[PDB]
Amino acid sequence: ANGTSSAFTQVDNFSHFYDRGNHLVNGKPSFTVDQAADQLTRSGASWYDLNGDGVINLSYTFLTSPPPGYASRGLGTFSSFSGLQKEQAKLSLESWADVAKVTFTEGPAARGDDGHMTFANFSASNGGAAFAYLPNSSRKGESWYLINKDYDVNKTPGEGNYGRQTLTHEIGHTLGLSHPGDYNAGNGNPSYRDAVYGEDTRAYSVMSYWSEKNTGQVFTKTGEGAYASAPLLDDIAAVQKLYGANMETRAGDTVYGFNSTADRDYYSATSATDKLIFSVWDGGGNDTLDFSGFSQNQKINLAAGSFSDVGGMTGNVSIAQGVTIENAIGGSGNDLLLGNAASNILKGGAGNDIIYGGGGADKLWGGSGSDTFVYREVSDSTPKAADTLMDFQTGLDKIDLTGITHLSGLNFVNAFTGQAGDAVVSYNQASNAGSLQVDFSGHGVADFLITTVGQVATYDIVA
Amino acid sequence: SLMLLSPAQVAGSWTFYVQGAEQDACTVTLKKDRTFSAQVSCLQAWLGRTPTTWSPTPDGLLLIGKDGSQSLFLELREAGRYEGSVEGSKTLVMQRA
Numbered sequence: 115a116n117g118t119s120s121a122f123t124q125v126d127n128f129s130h131f132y133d134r135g136n137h138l139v140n141g142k143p144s145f146t147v148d149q150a151a152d153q154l155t156r157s158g159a160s161w162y163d164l165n166g167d168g169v170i171n172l173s174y175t176f177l178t179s180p181p182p183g184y185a186s187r188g189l190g191t192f193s194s195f196s197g198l199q200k201e202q203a204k205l206s207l208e209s210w211a212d213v214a215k216v217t218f219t220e221g222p223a224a225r226g227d228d229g230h231m232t233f234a235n236f237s238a239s240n241g242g243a244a245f246a247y248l249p250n251s252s253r254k255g256e257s258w259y260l261i262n263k264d265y266d267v268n269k270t271p272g273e274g275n276y277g278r279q280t281l282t283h284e285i286g287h288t289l290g291l292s293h294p295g296d297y298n299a300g301n302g303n304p305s306y307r308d309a310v311y312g313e314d315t316r317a318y319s320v321m322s323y324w325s326e327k328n329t330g331q332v333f334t335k336t337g338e339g340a341y342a343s344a345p346l347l348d349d350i351a352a353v354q355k356l357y358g359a360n361m362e363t364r365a366g367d368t369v370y371g372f373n374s375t376a377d378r379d380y381y382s383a384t385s386a387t388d389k390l391i392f393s394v395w396d397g398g399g400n401d402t403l404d405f406s407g408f409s410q411n412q413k414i415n416l417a418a419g420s421f422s423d424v425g426g427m428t429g430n431v432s433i434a435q436g437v438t439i440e441n442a443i444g445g446s447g448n449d450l451l452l453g454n455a456a457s458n459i460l461k462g463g464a465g466n467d468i469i470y471g472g473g474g475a476d477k478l479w480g481g482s483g484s485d486t487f488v489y490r491e492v493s494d495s496t497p498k499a500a501d502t503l504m505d506f507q508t509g510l511d512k513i514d515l516t517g518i519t520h521l522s523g524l525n526f527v528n529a530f531t532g533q534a535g536d537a538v539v540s541y542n543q544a545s546n547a548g549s550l551q552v553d554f555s556g557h558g559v560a561d562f563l564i565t566t567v568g569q570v571a572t573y574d575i576v577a
Numbered sequence: 578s579l580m581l582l583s584p585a586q587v588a589g590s591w592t593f594y595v596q597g598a599e600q601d602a603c604t605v606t607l608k609k610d611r612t613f614s615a616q617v618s619c620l621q622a623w624l625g626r627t628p629t630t631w632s633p634t635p636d637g638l639l640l641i642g643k644d645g646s647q648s649l650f651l652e653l654r655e656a657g658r659y660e661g662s663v664e665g666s667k668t669l670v671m672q673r674a
């Protein structure tokens with residue numbers, strides 16, 4: 115940001131805003147994704163591929179009657195799962211099977227199984243809303259959920275609410291995840307103040323006890339917060355460390371958000387009021403984060419492992435480590451769209467947007483309004499791999515090169531003279547195509563090219 | 578998993594104060610529909626903006642501003658007591674009246 119434009123500083127602030135590792139957050143060590151995955155799996159508990167086929171294949175049963183010796187355990191009155199609990203639990207199990215090489219198929223324990231799981235309710239708690247057992251326990255596979263006439267949260271699980279996250283969370287225990295810290299409901303009065311690392315909040319893992327607001331994330335919209343229904347960034351990394359990434363999931367072209375083709379309730383948005391909280395896992399194909407239906411100002415990052423501010427919330431959308439997402443569509447707000455190393459299609463939509471294509475040849479649509487196309491390295495847009503600004507509006511849009519020039523300007527010339535920063539602006543009427551060629555290295559030839567659909571003028575360039 | 582308190586369970590009369598200034602307390606009613614009584618204006622001095630709704634979290638409570646999104650978080654410290662930070666690093670205490 116030193117010696118650069120405000121627009122570049124905005125992009126650069128946002129790309130670094132959620133950086134992790136090698137510093138302190140809230141007085142605690144900042145953990146990277148990989149460090150948090152280590153802590154989430156610190157028990158060392160796992161299932162094992164007993165039948166040797168590369169996959170943890172598990173059975174599960176909703177208990178219809180108290181299992182043998184239930185009264186021994188002192189859990190109060192037993193309950194079978196309601197229809198709603200079954201449906202939502204199936205969705206939670208699906209969201210784990212989506213990301214890691216584990217399968218959940220309902221049925222009794224069978225000879226082919228790597229293990230068996232059980233689901234039922236209890237009525238008497240000593241503090242916890244639910245509990246489960248790690249896969250090295252004698253009760254491996256069991257999870258239990260509290261329902262009495264002073265706690266009905268678990269009777270009404272649904273997308274975005276705490277009942278559904280609790281199912282995802284306790285299933286996470288049965289898979290081998292711990293709480294990010296050594297704490298448990300009903301044992302003392304645990305606090306985020308004593309967390310092991312800064313990113314132990316509900317913005318990073320459904321296993322955390324601690325509100326995302328502790329790390330600054332705003333998940334509140336229209337007077338109320340929400341809870342991720344599906345595994346978050348660190349959860350995905352942890353369960354994948356245990357059992358391996360499921361590359362088969364959504365391996366074709368996928369849209370997330372509005373117009374979602376992901377076929378998951380937590381990946382789908384259908385109105386500007388929606389509270390989206392998710393972490394994208396995707397196995398391949400040419401994919402799009404479509405946030406066109408929101409009117410709020412948004413900040414969208416296509417970097418793997420990175421966070422985005424979506425739908426008027428902050429830090430609520432992420433892309434899992436090891437996932438390449440190619441395209442992004444802003445809304446009618448004033449947005450930030452940040453690409454990655456792949457060829458990206460970025461569409462700002464209405465409002466004044468700032469677009470950063472990054473590496474490779476990107477196709478950048480500003481949309482209506484006054485949009486700024488930000489360049490940080492020469493390799494962002496080379497003569498052999500050049501961005502096209504697909505709807506460039508001269509006199510309104512801007513091309514910003516100050517991340518490269520540090521505001522030392524350009525030398526606009528008819529033909530390169532052999533000096534760094536020489537720039538040649540051309541227009542081809544038959545293609546309605548502008549060209550900006552720059553010789554940033556000073557070798558007498560272009561080492562930088564942006565193509566524009568629509569003429570581009572010297573006064574359209576910030577450098 | 579923490580037990581999430583219902584709005585009906587949180588509702589009632591609450592006293593707010595900043596530690597080191599215990600003599601400047603606010604008493605405010607939190608209503609089951611997640612609004613406040615008019616005395617919530619008393620919090621304006623510490624928070625700048627006045628909250629208009631509240632929402633329980635499993636580990637604490639959010640006081641949410643009029644735009645429906647901006648918030649102050651307070652962590653549940655013990656039964657009937659939440660704490661949060663205001664005015665830099667001052668400690669705001671919210672305790673059952």
Ligand SMILES: [Ca+2]
Nearest residue numbers: 163165169171
């Ligand atoms: Ca197996």
Ligand SMILES: [Ca+2]
Nearest residue numbers: 364368398399
């Ligand atoms: Ca895909």
Ligand SMILES: [Ca+2]
Nearest residue numbers: 398399401438
């Ligand atoms: Ca892809």
Ligand SMILES: [Ca+2]
Nearest residue numbers: 445447462464
């Ligand atoms: Ca926009």
Ligand SMILES: [Ca+2]
Nearest residue numbers: 454456471473
């Ligand atoms: Ca790119």
Ligand SMILES: [Ca+2]
Nearest residue numbers: 463465480481
């Ligand atoms: Ca625009």
Ligand SMILES: [Ca+2]
Nearest residue numbers: 480481482483
């Ligand atoms: Ca435009």
Ligand SMILES: [Ca+2]
Nearest residue numbers: 471472474494
């Ligand atoms: Ca590029």
Ligand SMILES: [Zn+2]
Nearest residue numbers: 283287293578
């Ligand atoms: Zn737990």
